[PDB]
Design a protein around this ligand. Structure first.
Ligand code: HEM
Ligand code: HEM
Ligand code: HEM
Ligand SMILES: [Cl-]
Ligand SMILES: [Cl-]
Ligand SMILES: [Cl-]
Ligand SMILES: [Cl-]
Ligand SMILES: [Cl-]
Ligand SMILES: [Cl-]
Ligand SMILES: [Cl-]
Ligand SMILES: [Cl-]
Ligand SMILES: [Cl-]
Ligand SMILES: [Cl-]
Ligand SMILES: [Cl-]
Ligand SMILES: [Cl-]
Ligand SMILES: [Cl-]
Ligand SMILES: [Cl-]
Ligand SMILES: [Cl-]
Ligand SMILES: [Mg+2]
Ligand SMILES: [Mg+2]
Ligand SMILES: [Mg+2]
Ligand SMILES: [Mg+2]
Ligand SMILES: [Mg+2]
Ligand SMILES: [Mg+2]
Ligand SMILES: [Mg+2]
Ligand SMILES: [Mg+2]
Ligand SMILES: [Mg+2]
Lengths: 158, 158, 158, 158, 158, 158, 158
């Protein structure tokens, strides 16, 4: 199905955001692991792998529409566990805004199946945002050192 | 262990090559799948996931040496199955050359464990090269259409 | 829920297309089987049975809306395996266009659950189109005789 | 049982042929594998291991007869799959002729158990010849590229 | 294989370091257990047993080279959990430096298998260093009392 | 329980003897293994590990009594299997004498639980002495070469 | 990867040594079995099969480097069990020396993966040497007739 160039453009913008999130979550996984926060690190790895699946779905849709997926292009880091979470959350807010605009563009152009892809991604993103906002609320309430302790394993495990 | 800046630089050059290979193999997986070469597509996916593990090991070593992993940066595509294989092979030859030079640099600077990482990557790469050269030899001998047929599934499978 | 006559009309147009696809895929199953392409034949049977389920869902929705399902009414055939695939693909493009227009009509009339039915059918159809386009691309690349061979079983199986 | 020198000589001629066949089949296994004909390669490996068992039986008989097994001594190669098969077949015809003459010599000298060893080897050899002649007939009938394709695995297997 | 006296000397220096580490880790296990840090204590026991295996491998290599293993000779203690970890880390840095120099000496003298032993020990040591540095980083970030709590069991377990 | 300095001194003398026995038995294990007496070697390894457990119990008791365990300090070797056994036996006789004197000192000072530890060690030691005396008696009766043969494995095992 | 001619030459020298060891160990297996030393015979068979795997790895590397493996070319025998072991040991010392020189040549020419192959073979060889030296030490200590008895089975087994 030869797709609308503007739809392919929006799918490629999403792909760039998702690839950036893959890399950011993976770097956060390895950073948190080195700091000793091995339980939060495992969650960050899982979040990276979820974004990998999103990137795969975007690539598949772009190829179906006979467009060219742009992976050649792809970061917010952080010096403590609060900054890492905040950086992830900023990324998710940015992706959410992109997908909201993209579903509107696909709807107006009549590509309702691409619209549906963006609707699914948007729902996913609000789930991720809910999770991260809750973690940052917990960190605020119990303090960063107890949040870190809660998200670390004893020495005989990891 | 605060690492030599030149060693961290070589690890980051490897990371850029590996991230590029992840993306190239994944794009090839989805492209080959859309063309109907679903068996070769599955191998390309597996090759991408192997390069993901290499990238992970490089990131881990960079962080141990107290360097900054550069993922912000990352392609050869192809219009038929021979060109896809050739593009993968060119990438592997380029990576091999990088790792050979890197093991020599780590050896001269006395970072023998980073040397060992590059030695492992080099052995891996020559394995990958052996595989791809064999596939291209088979394609040469039986022709591209029979090679494609061999690497496609019937309609009731995939 | 007494439905809009225009919505029931669009559901009946979909039912006619789906019943036509059931019959076409089933005839293709038996034709391909007689020609010896028993693996593609099995896929065509499966595609017919998928369209039977779609027809069932349309009938159920029409009856819920207190309309009369029109089954009394229901073809593109083909002389070789490429023509069979092309005929299936033309049918799918026609159905896709019908469902796109139907979801728009249901949306404008405020029957959002019927809209959702058409959205699901539209997504299904684009999946079917993706599959058939890939098979026709493979046939183009490896040639029709190798595509047929790939989709045939040896004599000791079927 | 102190054996006839002429019988020990014939057993040593067989051992030299068998050791040569071990080496030739093993080299063919690795060559075919590198060319991508991994299914025929596996058969060549199995044929090499069968010849290893024959060599073992010859060594055992020579030692029983209080002779000295000569292994210090041991090739036809090939540039394509037809030449490889032809080289194996020429070797088998040569071995068959040796074993026929050897059974006659053992019979005339009254070493009926060594005669029996050569009779078994001769029957084995005619089995091997039957197999190889059939493969070369198939290659002749379907052509070398289809024979190679039939004897190659897709990329996601080997 | 009668070994180079200088190689045997370096193997004996490693053995003395490893035996010292066995004793230090075991004393730390019992000390930490008495203080109530039973989870970190279990890790220290495991680390002692890993060093016992290293000592065994060194003794085996010395005997193969027809040298005399010197076990007759063998400590940093600590008053709190941070000091215990720091003492272990200082020991590991000292061992790493010894093994780096030893691999260079074996390489220059042409004892490449002893070189390989030291290369393995060096890689092990950098793993141990990575672990201990991470534990000390965690302790720094969450504080010593939370690190101790994390590494202690409730009264109904240990 | 703050212990008597004289009791802690006797526990530390026992620890020094036990650590010496660990090292001696382990060296004997590796020596006997290299000579080919692999069955006696396995027993010597087991004896070393038993002495490791004794050392652990001594360290635990010293720490309970708020003393400082001295591991910083720790040999009789042997050129044939009789000398190895004799060296082990001399060590056991020395340890037995130490533990006998130590139980008497603990009894007189009123540390009856430390007395009990030495009583257990003394009973253990007389068991070890019984075993070693029996092995040396067997060696005397059947001769050293048959004793060695009995305590060696064939080449296809170890 | 088109290899250095000097590297291919060293790989072929190793192949000739390994093929010679295969044959020597196999002949020793059958000889020892006929003499009644069936347990040592089984070990010699296992050693032959280990050398077969080494030869296979060498052939694979030569073909990858686009060289020609030379198998056309390939012995120390022995009249008693001590001479058989001594002949095996002389072969291993010769192979070790070859592999040491070969790893140095590959290193200087920059073929680090072939260097690694020779490093692995060298470590293997020193293991084999350790085993054989231990067997010859045992034979020296208990005498040849007891060593033979230890390595023979009773009549109701083999
Ligand atoms: C184009 C970009 C990428 C795509 C499309 C992608 C896709 C995937 C997919 C589909 C999986 C399978 C997950 C599952 O089975 O549930 C996966 C796993 C994984 N990914 Fe990625 N990935 C990408 C980039 C990366 C990067 C940059 C890394 C950095 C290390 C990475 C590391 C991993 C690892 C370690 C696994 C697990 C593999 C295993 O369990 O054996 N990936 N990826
Ligand atoms: C402070 C001195 C030592 C102490 C307290 C100690 C303690 C122990 C203990 C409690 C065990 C566990 C045994 C079991 O699970 O039944 C053990 C095992 C072992 N020990 Fe020691 N040990 C010491 C020194 C040594 C030395 C010098 C060596 C020389 C190699 C050694 C080699 C081993 C080995 C190989 C094991 C077996 C580990 C395994 O099975 O994974 N130990 N030791
Ligand atoms: C005197 C010459 C040789 C003799 C007598 C011999 C004998 C044997 C025998 C009896 C087996 C066991 C097969 C089975 O268990 O069914 C075997 C296996 C094998 N042979 Fe040979 N062989 C010889 C030469 C070679 C050569 C030149 C190669 C080249 C690579 C080779 C490679 C192998 C391999 C890889 C195996 C399989 C071992 C395993 O599965 O672990 N052999 N050989
Ligand atoms: Cl932090
Ligand atoms: Cl606090
Ligand atoms: Cl193609
Ligand atoms: Cl053709
Ligand atoms: Cl047709
Ligand atoms: Cl054709
Ligand atoms: Cl060919
Ligand atoms: Cl053709
Ligand atoms: Cl064909
Ligand atoms: Cl503390
Ligand atoms: Cl606090
Ligand atoms: Cl002895
Ligand atoms: Cl005697
Ligand atoms: Cl003998
Ligand atoms: Cl005697
Ligand atoms: Mg709308
Ligand atoms: Mg998500
Ligand atoms: Mg790889
Ligand atoms: Mg459908
Ligand atoms: Mg045969
Ligand atoms: Mg070097
Ligand atoms: Mg270690
Ligand atoms: Mg004891
Ligand atoms: Mg070996």
């Amino acid at each position: 199905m030869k797709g609308e160039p503007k739809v392919i453009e929006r799918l490629n913008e999403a792909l760039l955001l998702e690839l950036g999130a893959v890399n950011q979550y993976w770097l956060h996984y390895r950073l948190l692991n080195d700091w000793g926060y091995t339980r939060l690190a495992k969650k960050e790895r899982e979040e990276s792998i979820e974004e990998m699946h999103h990137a795969d779905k975007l690539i598949d849709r772009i190829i179906f529409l006979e467009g060219f997926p742009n992976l050649q292009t792809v970061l917010r880091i952080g010096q403590n566990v609060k900054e890492v979470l905040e950086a992830d959350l900023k990324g998710e807010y940015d992706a959410r805004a992109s997908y909201k605009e993209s579903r509107e563009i696909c709807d107006k152009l009549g590509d309702y199946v691409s619209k549906q892809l963006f609707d699914e991604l948007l729902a996913d993103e609000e789930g991720h945002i809910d999770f991260l906002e809750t973690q940052l609320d917990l960190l605020a309430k119990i303090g960063g050192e107890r949040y870190g302790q809660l998200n670390a394993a004893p020495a005989d495990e990891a």
